[PDB]
Amino acid sequence: SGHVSFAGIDYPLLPLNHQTPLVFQWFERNPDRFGQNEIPIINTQKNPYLNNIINAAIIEKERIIGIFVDGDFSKGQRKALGKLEQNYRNIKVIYNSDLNYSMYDKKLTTIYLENITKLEAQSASERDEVLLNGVKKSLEDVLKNNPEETLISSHNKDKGHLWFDFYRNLFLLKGSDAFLEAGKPGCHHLQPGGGCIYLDADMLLTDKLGTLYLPDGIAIHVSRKDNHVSLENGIIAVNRSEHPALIKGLEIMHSKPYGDPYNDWLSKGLRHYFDGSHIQDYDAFCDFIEFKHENIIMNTSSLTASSWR
Ligand SMILES: CC(=O)N[C@H]1[C@@H](OP(=O)(O)OP(=O)(O)OC[C@H]2O[C@@H](n3ccc(=O)[nH]c3=O)[C@H](O)[C@@H]2O)O[C@H](CO)[C@@H](O)[C@@H]1O
Ligand SMILES: [Mn+2]
Ligand SMILES: [Mn+2]
């Protein structure tokens, strides 16, 4: 087929051709745990993530493979990453410090003040007074510690998995263009305003992916463990920059206090985008949105060990 229907609307199954880059991510909170000439990406027996990435680059020879990294890497470590790119010409190491996300950002005071106003406009007998008090306390904390804290500055390395989860969604907003904005060479055959296929480093390719067809050009991982189905992070495929489903999620992150990249940006953003009146089941949405591929063994860490839990 060439279209699918969901919540009463028809959506074309849009192509992500074999150009569309794959993107892995490695945000490293403690790069001093690697040798100062070692590639600072986990590569243990239980988490063989650099090998998995290399193995994907070998399989997907004709396609760019981005590694989206962050952390306080040594010069020697950056040179080891440069050497990886020499050894596998399709790998492009993108430093999160080389991208500008200011167009997506918002001050935490602003979010808190907007939520306080809205709550105080509601009657005392109507409103969520516990929330109102929680938000006023978050505001006090920010004003005391760092008044200029923003959504983005707040999702830093000190926040565990929130650091990489938040920045992953930001990178997906940029899409293919992030390769160009970070000054990566040999990325000029990427489509301008193009998309990418984000994969967790334990999503093992066993053979080429080829051309993908996704509804409205978007799809996400679903777990089926079991008998059980949920949206999951860990595969995010888009055919274009600023996918409106992801923009919708960002609007939720800008209006909610305590917005979560998984629960709010990704899950509610997508579901509110494709099924805003909530007329169809969640399991049906999972089926509609599911990234399916027979040449990926998905989430292999859950059969071994989590790299951060
Ligand atoms: C549910 C699922 O199928 N995958 C998610 C799961 O990972 P899970 O719990 O499955 O953990 P994994 O070991 O697969 O690591 C997932 C990914 O997180 C990133 N990573 C991990 C550790 C680290 O120090 N630095 C780093 O950047 C990497 O991109 C890695 O690929 O929870 C993570 C944290 O909410 C999400 O990010 C993953 O998308
Ligand atoms: Mn089903
Ligand atoms: Mn995993």
Whether residues 278 and 133 share a domain: the answer is no
Q: Are 131 and 80 contained in the same domain?
A: no
Mark whether 140 and 281 lie in a shared domain.
no
Both 306 and 158 in a single domain?
yes
Bond prior to 37 in cis (omega within 30° of 0): no
Closest ligand to the CA of 309: 1
Q: Measured between alpha carbons, how far is 277 from 209 in angstroms, rounded to an integer?
A: 34
Q: Are residues 119 and 183 in the same domain?
A: no
Calpha distance 26→7 (Å, rounded) = 36
Answer yes or no: do 76 and 127 share one domain.
no
Question: Do 57 and 10 share a structural domain?
Answer: yes
**Residue among 47, 205, 296, 308 to mutate when testing ligand 1 (max atoms within 8 A of CB):** 308
User: Which residues have CB atoms below 5 A from the ion given as ligand 2?
Assistant: 283, 287
List Cβ<8 Å contacts ≥24 apart for 33-39.
Answer: 34/77, 36/74, 36/76, 36/77, 37/76, 37/77, 37/79, 37/80, 38/77, 38/80, 39/77, 39/80, 39/81, 39/83, 39/84
CB atoms within 10 A of CB 118: 13
β-bridge mates for residue 6, sequence order: 9
Ligand nearest to the CA of 27: 1
Are 68 and 26 in contact, with CB atoms under 8 Å apart?
yes
Full residue range of the structural domain in which residue 145 is found:
108-149
**Quick one: tokens of 231?**
């949206």
| Final residue belonging to a domain, choices 95, 116, 149 | 149
Ligand 1 pocket list (CB less than 6 A): 25-27, 161, 164-165, 200-202, 221, 232-234, 299, 301-302, 306-309
Q: Are residues 266 and 138 in the same domain?
A: no
Distance CA 199, CA 95 (A): 17
Task: Look at residues 116, 133, 149 and tell me which one is the last residue of a structural domain.
Answer: 149
SS3 274: helix
Output the CA torsion 198→203→205→210 (10° steps): -30
Residue 246's CB is within 10 A of a number of other CB atoms, namely: 23
269 and 120 in one domain?
A: no
| Strands annotated E in the chain | 3-6, 9-16, 22-27, 65-70, 91-95, 194-199, 204-205, 212-215, 218-223, 230-240, 296-297
Q: What is the rounded CA–CA span in Å between residue 223 and residue 229?
A: 6
89's enclosing H/E stretch is: none
Location of structure tokens 């907007």: 114
Structure obtained using: X-ray
Picking from 117, 149, 181, the residue at the C-terminal end of a domain is 149
Domain match, 159 and 248 both: yes
Resolution in A: 1.9
Q: Are 287 and 231 in contact (CB under 8 A)?
A: no
Determine whether 114 is an active site residue. no
Q: What tokens does 178 get?
A: 């992030």
Rounded-to-integer distance, Cα 199 and Cα 208, Å = 14
Same domain, 211 and 276: yes
Q: Give the number of the atom of ligand 1 that is nearest the alpha carbon of residue 299.
A: 3
137 shares its domain with 89 = no
Both tokens assigned to 33: 């745990």
CA dihedral 264, 265, 270, 273 (to 10 degrees): 90
Number of domains in the chain: 2
| 298 neighbors 221 (Cβ within 8 angstroms) | yes
